[PDB]
Write an enzyme that holds these catalytic residues in place. Structure first.
Site, PDB file in Angstrom:
ATOM      1  N   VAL A   1      46.239  48.077   6.835  1.00  0.00           N
ATOM      2  CA  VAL A   1      46.435  46.943   7.751  1.00  0.00           C
ATOM      3  C   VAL A   1      47.297  47.281   8.961  1.00  0.00           C
ATOM      4  O   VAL A   1      48.214  48.088   8.868  1.00  0.00           O
ATOM      5  CB  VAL A   1      47.023  45.749   6.970  1.00  0.00           C
ATOM      6  CG1 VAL A   1      48.428  46.016   6.418  1.00  0.00           C
ATOM      7  CG2 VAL A   1      47.084  44.463   7.801  1.00  0.00           C
ATOM      8  N   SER A   2      47.034  46.604  10.080  1.00  0.00           N
ATOM      9  CA  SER A   2      47.742  46.711  11.360  1.00  0.00           C
ATOM     10  C   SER A   2      48.285  45.330  11.720  1.00  0.00           C
ATOM     11  O   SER A   2      47.498  44.398  11.870  1.00  0.00           O
ATOM     12  CB  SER A   2      46.760  47.233  12.420  1.00  0.00           C
ATOM     13  OG  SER A   2      47.245  47.098  13.738  1.00  0.00           O
ATOM     14  N   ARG A   3      49.605  45.152  11.857  1.00  0.00           N
ATOM     15  CA  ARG A   3      50.196  43.846  12.201  1.00  0.00           C
ATOM     16  C   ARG A   3      49.863  43.385  13.614  1.00  0.00           C
ATOM     17  O   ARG A   3      49.909  42.191  13.892  1.00  0.00           O
ATOM     18  CB  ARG A   3      51.719  43.885  12.029  1.00  0.00           C
ATOM     19  CG  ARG A   3      52.129  43.893  10.553  1.00  0.00           C
ATOM     20  CD  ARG A   3      53.632  44.170  10.418  1.00  0.00           C
ATOM     21  NE  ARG A   3      54.141  43.654   9.143  1.00  0.00           N
ATOM     22  CZ  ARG A   3      54.836  42.538   8.965  1.00  0.00           C
ATOM     23  NH1 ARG A   3      55.360  41.858   9.944  1.00  0.00           N
ATOM     24  NH2 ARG A   3      55.017  42.087   7.762  1.00  0.00           N
ATOM     25  N   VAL A   4      49.530  44.313  14.513  1.00  0.00           N
ATOM     26  CA  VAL A   4      49.133  44.001  15.893  1.00  0.00           C
ATOM     27  C   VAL A   4      47.705  43.441  15.909  1.00  0.00           C
ATOM     28  O   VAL A   4      47.405  42.519  16.665  1.00  0.00           O
ATOM     29  CB  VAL A   4      49.309  45.234  16.791  1.00  0.00           C
ATOM     30  CG1 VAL A   4      48.894  44.952  18.234  1.00  0.00           C
ATOM     31  CG2 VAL A   4      50.780  45.671  16.820  1.00  0.00           C
ATOM     32  N   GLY A   5      46.826  43.951  15.045  1.00  0.00           N
ATOM     33  CA  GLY A   5      45.452  43.474  14.892  1.00  0.00           C
ATOM     34  C   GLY A   5      44.622  43.461  16.172  1.00  0.00           C
ATOM     35  O   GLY A   5      44.656  44.400  16.968  1.00  0.00           O
TER      36      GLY A   5
END
Ligand code: ATP
Ligand code: MG
Lengths: 115, 145, 116, 52, 73, 128, 219, 52, 73
Positions: I8-12
């Site tokens: 997962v990437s929190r910036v998305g």
């Protein structure tokens, strides 16, 4: 627990009890997921005797009478060997497993099965 | 939440009062029979008469053992609940009404048999006169309230 | 505490209560103290108590706190989650599945709990 | 047979209506007891709060 | 007498016994012990309640419940 | 004019619909069934049944035997999946008698059935 | 003991749990395939029963041996059982009901003959000593009525020869998707216009009744 | 008419039992409020006395 | 060997171009549906048509995620 000390009859009976209990222990996970019905006919017979042996090992003690009201029982070695040998040979395959719980001698298991 | 299967008192059996000591012997075994059969309630309508009666009694004793916080019971009040269950007076009562039956029975004895509750509360004694007095009151309760 | 003493009801948000526990472990290791079970500082329960006991309702006003909680290795029995749960009065669980249905706020009505 | 049926039918319906009234009177005795106990409880509780 | 049907019938407690109350968090451990103290108010037995590592607000609520039930004295 | 007709086997429906004429091989002779025909029942010999309809003037279905039942407003062919005859019928019965494996001549008066049934029935309850 | 072996056990059980979850959906799909095959067999048997009922009433001069009861001491049973395992008490509850009803005849002094369908039934009688007269096994999940002809004929001939006084079929009834009921059902001892009866009405009856019993066993 | 008389006798007892339950529950609600009335009155007077 | 189930990437979506942001929504969903249906793949002939349609798509999207070393697109 040596044939030269206790004699071959007692030694073979104790060995026979340990063999059945060891084999029942190995079937624990199979029985928990799929039940007894998926076992072979030879394993089903052994599981039934193992369950009777586990219950027959129980005994009401004289010092424990205060905890349950059940009278204590004293069992001779002669009566001990005779009871387990009979269960291993199948002489009690028709008795229900609850008949062996908290009974002093094999005769008391035969009387308890009539209730 | 008392787990009867593992909970135990090593020295309390000698300390328990005579009335509670005589009536409690069947309570412990009835809960064991329930723990062994409780999951079968979804199919128990198709079982043998003996197993059906053992399960039906275990369910009633389990329902009777429930109690609210800050609501303690005296020796006489606990004795009525235990006597009704041990002597089979709950067999014709549905599970959903065992709690209602208990609160109604205690309320009834508090007005119709106040002298008997006062006698039991002195020292929790249990003679033939007290046993006869309790069954007469429960039978009149079942037949009129 | 100043706003509480002005006769108000205050909200205190703590970004992550797990990092407060770890900062104590780091400082305790720097000071050379002998580590406890699972390597946490010997003062773990007392450091949590010193922080959490000030957050209460007093005769002048109150401080209510919302604290995000992280569970190490998904083990609820680990000393940090276990010490923290002794102080919590409620639990709000946010759900990924509920957010997918377009329902907001995405709070799980079956996993959330409250002592009140 | 028709007359006997009406006599038995009428007689048992008397028993049912007599029993129904007796059930309601016992409920009224219970109802009076629970409000009497509450009225005496409230009297002891107000005494506790004033002493406190 | 604790005042609970289940405890006084199956797990009786005698004068001078040590009886452990054991279980997971938030399942009635404090409730069972405080109700046992409340039931002693007319028995002649004097009570001591020791709160170790508890929240000050929890201790204050236990003391309020002891006086609401007449057991604090 | 048309009559409803169904050809049905012990396992499933072969045909179902409206027809103007049905032609089949009866055990005594061939037949031609039309709407309003009097109630008739007959045994059919192996062969093709011919159905007639507007456009569907030659809808033919092969049948291995069975029975034909007729009414003034309904027709039913109670078909067979395979040809039923004594030379085929007897071989299956002899095979069923031969397939009966025997190792012990038991009396059938055993009580053991109940003990093993109780043992397994209680085990199946612990499983759920 | 070690944290390595516990992880291996968790992985082993998780791998197993994935396939048992898949097999549940497979069993539902096969259950729907079986329910449509049950419905497809009903329009034939109900019509044969309607024809049998009319013919037996229109021709009182003849009464086939199947339509009259002989009160004597010998009985027959057709037992239906599975070939595969993984059943939550299906065969066990059926054999319990079979033994319950069989004992009534053993105690009344009557002799018993058995017909067996499926490997689990064969194993039960082979181990307990049942006197099986006809047997069949390893049939597909979609069985064909021609496979039943032999086993049913052996049981019908014994009734026609006077060896069997009553015949029953033992199997499970589909009450709902969550409930299977074990049952013992009798077989052999079963508008003002007449048919033309092209061949003899008595001959038709002697043939229609055999197709009716086979259709009941197939269903 | 005898079947109808039994159905009427059965209805009468079930209706009496339903009425009895309503009588007891209404009395329980009155009892609960009687204690609340006394508590609120006692707390109010306690606050008045201490403020004075 | 990117495990898209836990990676997962929190910036998305803020770190994606308009075209990749638009086309990736269906592919994320397809991989998620495949991870749930993967155990049923050995029994695909017995599944429901709608379930089989999702499984077949999930397999093709999963196969498309493969790529060789030193070959950036
Ligand atoms: N008999 C009961 N009937 C209904 N609710 C009860 C009962 N006993 C306890 N409770 C409720 O259970 C909840 C937790 O009880 P309690 O605080 O005593 O648990 P605890 O195990 O001692 O908690 P903690 O670990 O925080 O000390 C409270 O809401 C309490 O009111
Ligand atoms: Mg506590």
């Amino acid at each position: 627990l040596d044939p030269l000390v206790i004699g071959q009859d007692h030694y073979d009976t104790a060995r026979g009890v340990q063999y059945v209990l060891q084999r029942y222990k190995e079937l624990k996970d199979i029985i928990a997921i799929l039940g007894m019905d998926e076992l072979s006919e030879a394993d089903k017979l052994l599981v039934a005797r193992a369950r009777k042996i586990q219950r027959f090992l129980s005994q009401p003690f004289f010092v424990a009478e205060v905890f349950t009201g059940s009278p204590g029982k004293y069992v001779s070695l002669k009566d001990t060997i005779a009871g387990f040998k009979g269960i291993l040979n199948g002489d009690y395959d028709h008795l229900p497993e609850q008949a062996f719980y908290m009974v002093g001698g094999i005769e008391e298991a035969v009387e308890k099965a009539k209730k | 939440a008392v787990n009867a299967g593992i909970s135990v008192s090593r020295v309390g059996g000698a300390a328990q009062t005579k009335i509670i000591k005589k009536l409690s012997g069947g309570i412990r075994t009835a809960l064991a029979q329930y723990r062994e059969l409780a999951a079968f309630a979804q199919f128990a309508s198709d079982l043998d008469e003996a197993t059906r009666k053992q399960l039906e009694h275990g369910q009633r004793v389990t329902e009777l053992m429930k109690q609210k916080q800050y609501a303690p019971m005296s020796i006489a009040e606990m004795s009525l609940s235990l006597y009704a269950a041990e002597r089979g007076f709950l067999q014709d009562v549905e599970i959903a009404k065992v709690g209602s039956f208990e609160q109604a029975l205690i309320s009834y004895f508090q007005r119709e048999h106040a002298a008997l509750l006062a006698k039991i509360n002195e020292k929790g004694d249990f003679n033939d006169e007290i046993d006869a007095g309790i069954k007469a009151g429960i039978e009149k309760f079942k037949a009129t309230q | 505490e100043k706003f509480r003493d002005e006769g108000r009801d205050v909200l205190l948000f703590i970004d992550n209560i797990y990092r407060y526990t770890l900062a104590g472990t780091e400082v305790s290791a720097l000071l050379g103290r002998m580590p406890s079970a699972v390597g946490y500082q010997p003062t773990l329960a007392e450091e949590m108590g010193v922080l959490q006991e000030r957050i209460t309702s007093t005769k002048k006003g109150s401080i209510t706190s919302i604290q995000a909680v992280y569970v190490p290795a998904d083990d609820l029995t680990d000393p940090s989650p276990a010490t923290t749960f002794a102080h919590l009065d409620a639990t709000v669980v946010l759900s990924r599945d509920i957010a997918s249905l377009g329902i907001y706020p995405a709070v799980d009505p079956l996993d959330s709990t409250s002592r009140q | 047979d028709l007359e006997l049926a009406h006599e038995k039918a009428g007689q048992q319906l008397r028993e049912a209506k007599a029993q129904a009234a007796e059930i309601v009177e016992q409920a009224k005795k219970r109802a009076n007891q629970i409000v009497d106990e509450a009225r005496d409880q409230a009297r002891t509780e107000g005494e506790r709060l004033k002493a406190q | 007498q604790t005042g609970y049907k289940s405890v006084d019938a199956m797990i009786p407690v005698g004068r001078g016994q040590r009886e452990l109350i054991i279980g997971d968090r938030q399942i009635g451990k404090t409730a069972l012990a405080v109700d046992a103290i409340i039931n002693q108010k007319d028995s002649g037995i004097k009570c001591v309640y020791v709160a170790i590592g508890q929240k000050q607000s929890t201790i204050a609520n236990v003391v309020r419940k002891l006086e609401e039930n007449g057991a604090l004295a | 004019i048309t009559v409803h007709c169904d050809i049905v086997s012990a396992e499933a429906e072969i045909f179902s619909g409206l027809v103007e004429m049905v032609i089949a091989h009866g055990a005594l002779g061939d037949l031609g069934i039309a709407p309003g025909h009097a109630p008739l029942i007959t045994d059919l010999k192996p062969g093709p049944i011919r159905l007639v309809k507007q456009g569907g003037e030659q809808e033919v279905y092969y049948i291995s035997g069975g029975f034909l039942e007729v009414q003034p407003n309904m027709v039913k062919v109670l078909a067979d999946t395979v040809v039923r005859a004594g030379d085929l019928d007897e071989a299956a019965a002899q095979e069923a008698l031969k397939a009966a494996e025997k190792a012990l001549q038991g009396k059938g008066a055993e009580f053991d059935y109940s003990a093993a049934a109780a043992r397994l029935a209680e085990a199946a309850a612990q499983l759920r | 003991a070690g944290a390595k072996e516990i992880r291996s056990k968790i992985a082993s059980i998780k791998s197993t749990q994935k396939i048992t979850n898949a097999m549940e959906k497979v069993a539902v799909s096969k259950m729907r395939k079986a329910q449509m095959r049950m419905a497809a067999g009903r329009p034939y048997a109900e019509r044969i029963r309607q024809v049998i009922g009319h013919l037996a009433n229109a021709n009182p001069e003849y009464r086939h041996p199947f339509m009259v009861e002989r009160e004597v001491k010998r009985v027959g049973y057709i037992v239906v059982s599975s070939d595969r395992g993984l059943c939550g008490g299906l065969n066990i509850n059926l054999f319990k009901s079979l033994v319950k009803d069989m004992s009534g005849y053993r105690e009344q002094g009557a002799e018993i003959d058995l017909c067996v369908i499926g490997s689990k039934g064969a194993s039960f009688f082979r181990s307990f000593g049942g006197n099986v007269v006809a047997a069949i096994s390893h049939l597909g999940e979609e069985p064909s009525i021609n496979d039943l002809i032999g086993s049913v004929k052996v049981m019908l001939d014994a009734y026609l020869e006077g060896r069997i006084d009553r015949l029953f079929v033992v199997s499970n009834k589909f009450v709902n998707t969550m409930t299977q009921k074990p049952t013992v059902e009798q077989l052999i001892p079963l508008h003002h216009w007449d048919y033309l009866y092209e061949p003899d009405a008595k001959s038709l009856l002697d043939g229609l009744l055999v197709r009716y019993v086979e259709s009941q066993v197939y269903q």
